[model samples]
Target: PSFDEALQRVGEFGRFQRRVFLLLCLTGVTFAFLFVGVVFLGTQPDHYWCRGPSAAALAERCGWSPEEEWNRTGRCQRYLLEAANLAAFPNRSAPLVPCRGGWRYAQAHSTIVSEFDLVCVNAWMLDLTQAILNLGFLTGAFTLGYAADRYGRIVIYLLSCLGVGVTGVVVAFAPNFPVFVIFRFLQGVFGKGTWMTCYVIVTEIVGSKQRRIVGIVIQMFFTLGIIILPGIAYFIPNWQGIQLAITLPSFLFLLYYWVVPESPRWLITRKKGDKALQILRRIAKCNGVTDEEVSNPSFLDLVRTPQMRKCTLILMFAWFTSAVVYQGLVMRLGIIGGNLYIDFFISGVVELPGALLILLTIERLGRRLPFAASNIVAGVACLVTAFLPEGIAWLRTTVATLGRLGITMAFEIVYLVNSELYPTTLRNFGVSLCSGLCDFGGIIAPFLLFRLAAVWLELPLIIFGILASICGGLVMLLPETKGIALPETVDDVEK
Candidate 1:
């Protein structure tokens, strides 16, 4: 079919299409911030170094002023105030003051207080802050994720968006560490749910020919979010302020309720033929179709067969791998131990090209090779960066940046390819479950980068390389889905 003919079949992109597109684009921003928020949330106060408590603290004393406790005369040895201090309040930073043996700083004058930071260093609180978000993500994925599938996509999507707006606000004003972590986690859970739904809804609404484009467009907005994030962080230059800057926008997305509709394709599968018919009519009208001419096919009638389960499982793994590598890579950037804004911005700038790569290649080259190749390339880059000469900082960075590019492409492509691989009946569920793996990866990533990286700074990179290479190799296992109509049933899997 000619381009115009294909366009004519789907009908003109009408108000409904535009509305839905806008909604998805907004959700895209939410995902972008959630994924990268660690850059800000993990920020610790300036010039912070480890110092054990004052002499009086050794006598189990109290009442030390922030400055008095950290005075040069104090017994506490000064060290960099990194987040390694997981527990032991008001004590020296990790690896500096071991919990046992030494006189360490005494408790009485030990506690340090500051104007901007806590008297005692609470850096681990930041790690836990992010971990809590990931924990929220893990829970939110299974909870809100299933909710989007069972109850209704549009309703769940909106509620999650509301959650992002509400919790995001609370987090911005959070007065203490406890309050901050609470709201941030809530933001992660709901923010993630909203992201999952937006992708699901968009894929379900478009025609087969339009699906790939819609998916990539959604991803492109996410990159736009990344680009926006560093600027917000740079401009705000404060933790709470940056949180509000990224999150307040979600409230505006609540406006999507009137604009984007329920996935007609989802409705069609649930025996709501008439409702699906209404949406199809709208789509046809946009694409130029009449109710009389178009068959109102229930999506279940298309892809709910048995053999497809295997394909679904494999696709899910691919989804899981892509997310793990993608998120793990981004999170890895935060702990790279330099000016985060510059490091983050430079790596983030490399991500914009990913959307372009997906937009042009998926249809022409098919999903399997690109997906696999992206992974393999990321893995290779990861390995190369690990062994790069120590003094060649630029060379090491450039190679790492290439790895970032490779994984970013794979991450974006996985979503698009995932939507295509499944039958309509299982499409959303597949996407949610698979992409949620990214969260699973998210949860695991920090521990790896933080804990493991501490042991061997380059260890995380080596691990990431291996995962990417294996994941890329796994991509080879998937059959190419290019030029094929989306499979409708388990029976279709064999074909």
Candidate 2:
């Protein structure tokens, strides 16, 4: 009999699974902290200026107010000190010079920008810092699944907890920018081990009915983490402190090894039926399942199989589009002109309802209808928001908010659907592999939005709309995993 049949009789979400799920959910809290950590720790100063060696002294000698001093030169340049008199600078008398001394910020900050003086020509490095992490996300997301698929989910997940903790701490202690970015990259890479593995494990252990709720709830913990991050950053008040605060707690996740068992679903797919049954029997004693199967998926297998090939491509784009829209949309929130901390809170908080909406729609509408609608609705929101007459702050932001909600709903579904669409043999590998595109999409978000918005403020929103509309249409091509069991083999996926 299939694993689902066994799971049904044993218990879908028994007391044992409940404890495991809660522990697994802990990782999601930390996952968001890592994924969103760069926001608080890696910073671009809100206000900065060229700090001439004698500029401050010169301004004082001239008795110029700070605003008057700032007005005397381009942000990156200052009146030459050669003449050595600030009042003498009509600019024709003394030409402007690039800031050789350093820069001053309007406010104090303990961040990459403040530490590295990444204010002027080096300001772009902050972007590089962020991109490096996304690159880490892409590499880790794509590559680590093989480790999980081959070595076993529990080992990879535990090792990832160890790796993320070490690298994250190392990132905080980094003496220079070069070392900081390297470990930041590693932190992102190890991050995949914790996040994707948990998603697969939680999905695999529960019955079809319990799958969506477990998946949604675990993900909700991320929203919680994101909501809590600003609070942590505010209280800690320094980049290193913030990093340590987020990283040190992960050391505790290593303890999950004692209580959490290897996922029986993953074991069965590897053809370890004896251990698989033993794990399932224990689950039955606690709440569980049985079956053993394997295909040892190669990269070629993902595309060589026709149905899977179609699923592979569609899921990749869906993941890609959701990330692009969500990330890009969040960055756009700056135009609203509020404190970034508050704006970020609002942005993250808005995503909460989308999680509930997933469960609500799943009950009434099922997966396919809700899935397509979220993307299409987001598409509509972006387009509508873009076309709205500007200067009506309330309307523009309100409409854009819809795009956020839509992306949130769409993003949540991809995790669960991706888990089900792939056969158990390749489920972990498939979600990680497909969601790698999500990371790629995240990296592209800033590049796309920043560049497009430079030309016309709303241009990227239009593109986002069109891209999501196409994504939604293609999603319609995908089979709903609503009532389906976790397919155990490539053969199961095809039929």
Query: Could you say which candidate leads in TM-score?
Result: 2
Top lDDT prediction, candidate number: 2
Each prediction's TM-score against the native? 0.75, 0.90
Q: How many clashes (backbone N, Cα, C below 3 Å) per candidate?
A: 30, 1
Candidate 2 C-alpha error for residue 369, in Å: 0.6
| Per-residue lDDT of candidate 2, residues 1-495 (tens digit) | 466677867868678889888988989999999887887875666566775557666665767544655554527776656665545455367666776656766545677777777766787777787789889988998889877887788899999999999998898888988888888899999998889988888877787786778888988998999988888888878888998999987889997775877787776654677888787777777432334345456787767777788889999988888988877666665544467778777777878899988976775677878888889988998888778666566766676778889878888887778888887767778878877888888777877787998999889988888999996568888878767667766555554
Q: Give the Cα error of residue 243 in candidate 1, in Å.
A: 2.5
TM-score of candidate 1 to 2 decimals: 0.75
Q: Which residue runs of candidate 2 sit more than 4 Å off their true CA positions?
A: 50-74, 80-95, 104-106, 284-295, 335-337, 390-393, 450-457
